[PDB]
Design a protein around this ligand. Structure first.
Ligand code: NMF
Ligand code: NMF
Lengths: 320, 314
């Protein structure tokens, strides 16, 4: 069975994620690598009307006190369902085609390389959590999303981004999505979330156990480094009043959500790309990065062409 | 490895009695059976404040014309998340323990029997689909939920209820839930959804292919018009040329994959509580059992179930 390399390019928007990807795809042959692009069209029309505009407009009004927290929460939750839709369904139809791991460290080239614009967890965790830090969503809702995160397939290579705050602020200020607004508070939140995420993965892969270190709560990089403090991982966010019982402990329903969160991340292959350079540099940087990325076997000989058709149909329809 | 039997008591709400339910609480009394009840406490306090009320009030306000279909959709979509949270979490933590089939039936009794009050497709598929037929949810949000439906593990036995509409109206009016309003339209919609649902599983199990039979919605197994697929011949999901968008067509593929491997059993609710308990006990001799993955799986499950019942149960 021919091998396959799936690479999800995630992280906070506005760092040059797309450009880095497009350039990388432009290097390979026409049909030895395929890009599953950002589904702007689904966010803008197919799924709903201008979802990005709706999201930022809501956060704005909430900040001005024109609407309540409850009002902003119901809108955000719904919008994040629409945002994650293309991500979630692509995975669902992709799963059966994914087999066991093959490996990168000394292993032949993949018959096909799949490059994704973001991973499901982006719309089901990272951004939902960032909105919680903005009082625009509830911890209960976010955890509800976490429990919906699909099982992590073998060889799930996720690439996050690194970029100085100022460089990121300037870069973001220039290029923004249709319907977006310039929110620095949101940028901080989303940046902090992806920082935690990275730590949470390393923490988990170092034998970390949130249940064992939970008491250490009261008052970044993956693939490398020592075991992080739990207060520096995603777990630290859910030390909220709404989730705590009289005895100060988490309700078991939310504790099980954290068990799912850990189960999902502990088997991912997270990498970090330094977006503080020229587009050409980034392309090459990501290129070296992909060398040591876990590949997997497919389940059928006719899986490869199927996935190519899948990726291209996706691009043709939901692509900008 | 020890065997397990999972039974999801589903179907439209309001068909049974409280006595019919307490018998099921008396079933879990023994340690070879556990009864995961409805997470009412999570719906009223934990997840949010009086969720069911917010659902029925929103619909009511939509009908009177105080809010827009867009305003309602947002809330209904949010409310359904809260509703299915306990179901999703339980599945996610339970899944890893579930092994493969164990020559179900014609084989030794289970080491444990797990009875749930509803399956995750109740809050993800059925009720969202009904609210769509109520004009309170968009067909995009529904298929969005469908995409998030957990993979159907082996031994997924689901019991749906049978009951004349007039009889259902009686029992429903006497056992109303906190914040609920008696809506006959919603009763018709939810009944239709579960009707189609049963037709869908048979359709798929008899070799039905929605992409193949899709043309009939515009021009031995049920007709595609009698299955859940018929609802999604909706204008919001179609391109200018009437073609179903691929992203939605993929969501239907997922639906077809989820529903096919399930095992459906119908419980005649038109009788006494004792009669219902017996019938349910009868159906178990045809339900699919499975093995568990670890030795300590059994106690972990039992522990899980009773922690649920004690925390979110009434
Ligand atoms: C994914 C995602 C985003 C980022 C997305 C980048 O392609 C659109 F800019 N954003 C801004 C958001 O507000 N919610 C989301 O779920
Ligand atoms: C599951 C479910 C229901 C039915 C449920 C019965 O146990 C609570 F009454 N209802 C009324 C609802 O409005 N949304 C739902 O997701």
């Amino acid at each position: 069975m021919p091998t396959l390399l799936r690479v999800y390019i995630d992280g906070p928007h506005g760092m040059g994620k797309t450009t880095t990807t497009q350039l990388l795809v432009a290097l390979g042959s026409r049909d030895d690598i395929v890009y599953v692009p950002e589904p702007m069209t689904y966010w803008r029309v197919l799924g709903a009307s201008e979802t990005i505009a709706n999201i930022y407009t809501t956060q704005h009004r909430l900040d001005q006190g024109e609407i309540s927290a409850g009002d902003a929460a119901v809108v955000m939750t719904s919008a994040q369902i629409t945002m994650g839709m293309p991500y979630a369904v692509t995975d669902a139809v992709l799963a059966p085609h994914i087999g066991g791991e093959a490996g990168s460290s000394h292993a032949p080239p993949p018959a096909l390389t799949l490059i994704f614009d973001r991973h499901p967890i982006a719309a089901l965790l990272c951004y939902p959590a960032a909105r919680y830090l903005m009082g625009s969503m509830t911890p209960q809702a976010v955890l509800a999303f976490v429990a919906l995160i699909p099982p992590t397939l073998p060889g799930t290579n996720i690439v996050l981004g690194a970029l100085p705050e100022d460089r990121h602020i300037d870069r973001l200020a220039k290029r923004q999505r249709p319907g977006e607004r310039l929110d620095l508070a949101m940028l901080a939140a989303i940046r902090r979330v992806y920082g935690l995420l990275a730590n949470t993965v390393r923490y988990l892969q170092c034998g970390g156990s949130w249940r064992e270190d939970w008491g250490q709560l009261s008052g970044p990089q993956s693939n490398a480094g020592p075991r992080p403090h739990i207060g520096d991982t995603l777990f630290t966010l859910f030390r909220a009043p709404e989730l705590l019982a009289p005895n100060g402990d988490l309700y078991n329903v939310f504790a099980w959500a954290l068990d799912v969160l850990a189960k999902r991340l502990r088997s991912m292959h997270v990498f970090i790309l330094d977006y503080d350079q020229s587009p050409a540099g980034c392309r090459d940087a990501l290129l070296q990065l992909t060398s040591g990325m876990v590949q997997t076997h497919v389940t059928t000989p006719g899986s490869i062409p199927t996935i190519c058709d899948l990726a291209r149909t996706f691009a043709r329809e939901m692509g900008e």
